[PDB]
Amino acid sequence: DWKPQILAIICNWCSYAGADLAGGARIQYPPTVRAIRVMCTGRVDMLFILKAFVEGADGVLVSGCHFGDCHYLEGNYKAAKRMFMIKNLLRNIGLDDRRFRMTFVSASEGAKWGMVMEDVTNTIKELGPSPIKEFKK
């Protein structure tokens, strides 16, 4: 039974609030994703995601605020640019670009957070362990 290793970097104001609301509503989801809780998900550098993938992450999830709903008014657009370029980079280096995703969860969507956890867990179990672990890292 191989245990997937998904890392999440979720902003304080919307995604973290959404996860808190999901917990408050007693919405169940598998215990596979652990969070980081940056302030604005525009704090997320590309080197964070790449370091996670190198260190042995099986999947990476970054959750922010809906466009036009950022607490700092522009962070999620910078994050979106960075994550689009990250998807390019993971495809072009031979990694599966579907191992990484960025979601937009607001503070009122706990059920959406549970659905996202289920979907990410299912996708990563389908893809299997990261190839980077086998090749000498």
């Binding site: 808190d20 989801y29 215990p31 302030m39 604005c40 704090r43 550098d45 042995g56 910078k78």
Partner: protein
């Protein structure tokens, strides 16, 4: 080696202990790299919990503390205060959310897995806390002055509110008088009170207040700085006439311009009056109207011929200086309020209404001036074509509004329905037997006592044709106006004959308002008005700190809504002045100038314009205005060189969390 961290795990009374093994979590934390003590307690948000935290801090000499409990947004201030009481910096505390994210979502049949997730969360929290520094709270002092740009009702209200709060305030008015648009109105909907009558006490209060410097006939030349200290350079336009204070300062004991008016009586130059929409004559030396706050009689220098007759008209008082130029004043303010107001949309476009080519077609402000008793005539509405009183007046509502054709405006001007009703009432009252026709397309009486006003207007005899005017022709013999539209109710085409046609034109920001709002770093909205900090919960604020918006410059409004907005802006501006300090965000960005390369990419990356490129030790580096930064982290996450330090969320601390996730 030096960091010693204490881990404390809360049971939350079988809320956490019912889903995971707390003993396993504690015994695991006892073996983490930097851990001096690991303890468990039932309710650590209670006073015994704080007592235990303090006792452990004192007896193990902990460098930092990690609490495995509910979400930080619930009890982070609580445990920060707990840690501060005990001899540790508040921001040396770290929290692991093991209830909202581990115990309440993994209840059923997930016991070993939930414990493993708790171990991972505690590991990541300890890894972050081992690299946490001391964040001493710091603040920026605030200059105890305020600036209000715009002397209208919004600017006047904001200035009076700030002054009566005990704050010295500058009121900067472009025109020689403050009153604004309200001074041009004859009556006010829906109460029909005289506008000058309700506004004159406010104007004299502004003029008399010791805490307000009323600088009229001047504008803002440039602005620099931030919320703590705005250095604003103003140009005092050459007024040409001295006030008694300025006359005494100049040297002569003779007073300056008691307002007698002899100069205007002898001036031989005639020019249009902007206050009367250009329908009335005025001299080169003049006042807008009799009820001007500073009764000081400006001279129009680009129209004066320097004949020097007004100086003999003003002898022994020497109030007139024909040969002085604009001065520049550098003022040091704390906050600023923008109240620039509005102007009329140019309805000379939209050719099917003959505003400029037909003589008996006028706009609403011209109508107000023509029907006011202080206007070019004795309040007698007369036709511009021949001066005869009209018996039939049409009102074209929505003139240039809700228009998506690119000529007019796509928004509603908010008050054109109400003052059109007021104008219809005024014509039907002042001229007996006159009939008002209102060509309307969605009558909008939304405010308090507005629907009752609409009912009363209909009851007094006003005709409402529900149809946007298609076009307007004029008869060559009698300059009467044929108005062609459809009565969509009754479903028939209609050609209405009117002696006078009044266009309820849309409103737009005043000329030069966009340059001013760029000068203060305020962004425009997609309608072209000044943008708000938050459209819902901060109607007065702006993204730039220390700048607040009041009045129609934020968007078209009624006088009561404008006054409410102005008072709110005054309160928001007074708050930092009253406190005397602006507390910086606990987690601002710092530039490590030893690593900056002066590329300047990050400058355009901050929504709040905090980042700028400046010299330091002869090198071009980045400078962070801490008063503007908000700890978003966008710049720190971008800079390739790692020259920006997001404290409490630094790159070393976040990577430390990621490293510990993939550890044992």
């Amino acid at each position: 080696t030096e960091p010693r961290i204490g881990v404390f795990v809360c049971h939350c009374g079988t809320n956490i202990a019912g889903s995971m093994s707390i003993d396993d979590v504690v015994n695991y934390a006892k073996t983490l790299p930097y851990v001096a003590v690991a303890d468990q307690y039932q309710y650590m948000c209670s006073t015994p919990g704080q007592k235990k935290i303090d006792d452990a801090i004192k007896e193990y000499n902990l460098t930092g503390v990690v609490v495995a409990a509910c979400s930080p947004r619930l009890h982070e201030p609580t445990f920060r205060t707990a840690t501060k009481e005990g001899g540790l910096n508040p921001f040396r505390f770290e929290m692991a959310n093991i209830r909202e994210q581990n115990s309440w979502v993994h209840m059923h049949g997930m016991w070993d897995e939930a414990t493993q997730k708790a171990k991972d969360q505690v590991r990541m929290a300890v890894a972050k806390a081992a690299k946490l520094e001391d964040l001493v709270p710091k603040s920026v002092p605030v200059e105890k002055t305020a600036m209000v740009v715009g002397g209208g009702v919004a600017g006047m209200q904001a200035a009076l509110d700030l002054a009566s709060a005990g704050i010295k305030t500058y009121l900067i008015e472009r025109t020689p008088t403050i009153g604004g648009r309200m001074s041009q109105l004859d009556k006010t909907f829906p109460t029909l009170d005289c506008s000058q009558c309700i506004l004159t006490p406010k104007m004299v209060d502004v003029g008399r207040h010791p805490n307000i410097e009323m600088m009229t006939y001047t504008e803002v030349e440039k602005v620099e700085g931030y919320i703590g200290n705005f250095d604003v350079t103003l140009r005092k336009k050459a007024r040409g006439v001295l006030t008694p204070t300025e006359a005494t300062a100049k040297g002569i004991v003779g007073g300056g311009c008691n307002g007698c008016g002899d100069c205007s009586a002898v001036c031989p130059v005639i020019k249009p009056n902007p206050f009367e929409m250009g329908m009335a004559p005025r001299k080169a030396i003049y006042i807008y109207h009799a009820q001007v706050m500073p009764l000081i009689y400006t001279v129009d220098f680009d129209s004066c011929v320097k004949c020097g007759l007004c100086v003999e008209a003003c002898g022994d008082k020497k109030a007139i200086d024909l040969e002085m130029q604009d001065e520049f004043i550098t003022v040091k303010v704390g906050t600023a309020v923008l109240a620039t107001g509005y102007e009329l949309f140019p309805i000379e476009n939209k050719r099917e209404w003959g505003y400029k080519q037909f003589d008996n077609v006028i706009n609403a402000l011209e109508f107000e001036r023509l029907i006011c008793a202080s206007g070019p005539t004795g309040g007698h509405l007369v036709r511009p074509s021949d001066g005869k009183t009209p018996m039939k007046v049409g009102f074209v509502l929505c003139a240039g509004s809700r228009d998506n054709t690119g000529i007019g405006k796509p928004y509603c001007s908010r008050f054109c329905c109400m003052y059109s009703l007021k104008h219809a009432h005024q014509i039907m009252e002042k001229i007996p037997g006159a009939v008002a026709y209102l060509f309307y397309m969605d009558i909008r009486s939304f405010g308090k006592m507005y629907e009752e006003f609409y009912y009363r207007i209909q009851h007094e005899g006003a005709k409402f044709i529900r149809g946007r005017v298609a076009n307007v022709l004029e008869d060559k013999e009698t300059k009467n106006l044929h108005v062609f539209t459809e009565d969509t109710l009754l479903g028939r085409p209609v050609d209405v004959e009117v002696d006078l046609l009044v266009l309820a034109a849309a409103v737009q920001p005043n000329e030069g308002a966009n340059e001013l709002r760029k000068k203060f770093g305020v962004s425009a909205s997609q309608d072209g008005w000044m943008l708000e900090a938050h459209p819902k919960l901060n109607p007065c604020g702006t993204t730039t700190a220390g700048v607040f918006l009041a009045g129609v410059c934020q968007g078209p409004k009624d006088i009561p809504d404008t006054v409410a907005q102005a008072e709110g802006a005054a309160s928001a501006a007074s708050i930092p002045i009253h406190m005397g300090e602006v507390e910086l965000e606990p987690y601002f960005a710092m530039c490590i100038d030893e690593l900056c390369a002066g590329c300047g990419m990050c400058v355009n990356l901050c929504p709040y314009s905090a980042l700028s490129l400046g010299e330091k030790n002869g090198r071009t580096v980045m400078v962070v205005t801490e008063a503007k930064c908000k700890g978003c982290g966008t710049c720190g996450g971008f800079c390739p060189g790692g020259a920006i330090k997001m404290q409490h969320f630094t790159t070393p601390q976040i990577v430390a969390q990621i490293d510990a996730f993939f550890a044992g």
